[PDB]
C-alpha cells in the first residue's frame, strides 16, 4: 500500500505510531506535525525508524540555522529578486500548486558573481517554504489534503553555459537542500522543450537526486502542451505554456507570476571570480 494516511499497511501503521512516540520532542519546533507530515520523512526512508529519525532530527537542525519561521518574510537581494527566474502560477487539476523553472534566460555566471551562494540557497529555501505555504492554504480551501506540488520544468534555451562547473556545484547544493528538506513535496516534473544537451546536464545533476525525485522526471516531446493540458486546466497555464493566462494587463508570459530572468546588468557584480 501507498504509505499515505487512509492507505496504511500495519506495519506501516505501526512505524508511524513508533516514529510519532519517538520524535515527540522535537514535533513543537515543526509546522503541523500531523501523521501527513510525519509520513513524508518514513516514506523517504521506507518506513526505517533510524534513518527517519536521523533525516527529521537533522531538518529540525536545519529549521533552526536557517530560521526557516522567519523566512517568507525575508526579500532576497535586488539581483536575485529581480533575475532570478521562475515562479509559482496557478492549480494543476487536483489543486497541486504549480511552480515554473525557466532555464534558458537564467544568466548563472552573472548571478554568482552579484550574490552569495548563501543567499541563493536561501532564496530556493524561501519558494519551498511558499509552495508549501500554498499548499496549506488548498488544503484548507478544498477539504482535503494538498502537500505536494507540480513543477513545469522550461528548458528552451539550456546550453554550455549553464554546465558552467560553479553553476552546477551550487545548483547541486540546491537539490541536496531539497531532498533532505522537503521530502516527498514533489508530485510530478515536466521537462518541456529539452534539447540535444539535455540529457548530458541531466546526468550531471542525478547524483544529487533520490531515486523518488527520478521516478517523477517527465521529459516531454513536441506535444508538450497537450500533455500539460491533460494535468492542468488551461484557465491555470499561461497562454506561454500552452493555457489562456494572462497578467491583468494581458501579457501572455503571466510575469507578475513569473520571473524570466535576462542577463545581469554589470552594475550588481559583487566579485571578478568565483
Ligand atoms: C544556487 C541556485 C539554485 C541558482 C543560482 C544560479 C545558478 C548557479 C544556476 C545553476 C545553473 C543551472 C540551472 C543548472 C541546472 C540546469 C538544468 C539541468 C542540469 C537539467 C536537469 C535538471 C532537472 C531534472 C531538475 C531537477 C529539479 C528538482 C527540483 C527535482
Ligand atoms: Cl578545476
Known amino acids: ?28 519546533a515543526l509546522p503541523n506535525p500531523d501523521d501527513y507530515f510525519l509520513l513524508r520523512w518514513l516514506r523517504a526512508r521506507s518506513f526505517d525508524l533510524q534513518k527517519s529519525e536521523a533525516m527529521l532530527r537533522k531538518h529540525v537542525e536545519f529549521r533552526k540555522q536557517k530560521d526557516i519561521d522567519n523566512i517568507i518574510s525575508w526579500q532576497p537581494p535586488e539581483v536575485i529578486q529581480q533575475y532570478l527566474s521562475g515562479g509559482m502560477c496557478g492549480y494543476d487539476l487536483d489543486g497541486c500548486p504549480v511552480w515554473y523553472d525557466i532555464i534558458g534566460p537564467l544568466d548563472a555566471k552573472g548571478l554568482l558573481f552579484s550574490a552569495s551562494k548563501q543567499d541563493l540557497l536561501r532564496t530556493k529555501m524561501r519558494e519551498c517554504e511558499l509552495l508549501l505555504q ?48 522537503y521530502p516527498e513535496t514533489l508530485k510530478r516534473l515536466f521537462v518541456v522543450k529539452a534539447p540535444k544537451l539535455f540529457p548530458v546536464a541531466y546526468n550531471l545533476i542525478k547524483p544529487f537526486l533520490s531515486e523518488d525525485t527520478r521516478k517523477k522526471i517527465m521529459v516531454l516531446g513536441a506535444n508538450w502542451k497537450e500533455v500539460l493540458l491533460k494535468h492542468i486546466s488551461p484557465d491555470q497555464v499561461p497562454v506561454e505554456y500552452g493555457g489562456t493566462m494572462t497578467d ?20 550588481y557584480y559583487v566579485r571578478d571570480q568565483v
Open 1 to 28: 500500500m501507498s504509505g499515505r494516511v487512509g492507505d496504511l499497511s500495519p506495519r506501516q501503521k505501526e512505524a508511524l505510531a513508533k516514529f510519532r512516540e519517538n520524535v515527540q520532542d522535537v514535533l513543537p
Open 134 to 181: 500554498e499548499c496549506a492554504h488548498q488544503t484548507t480551501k478544498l477539504g482535503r489534503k494538498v502537500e505536494t506540488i507540480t513543477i513545469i520544468y522550461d528548458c528552451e534555451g539550456l546550453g554550455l553555459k549553464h554546465l558552467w562547473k560553479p553553476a552546477v556545484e551550487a545548483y547541486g547544493e540546491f537539490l541536496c537542500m531539497f531532498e533532505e528538506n
Open 248 to 267: 491583468p494587463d494581458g501579457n501572455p508570459k503571466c510575469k507578475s507570476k513569473i520571473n524570466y530572468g535576462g542577463d545581469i546588468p554589470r552594475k
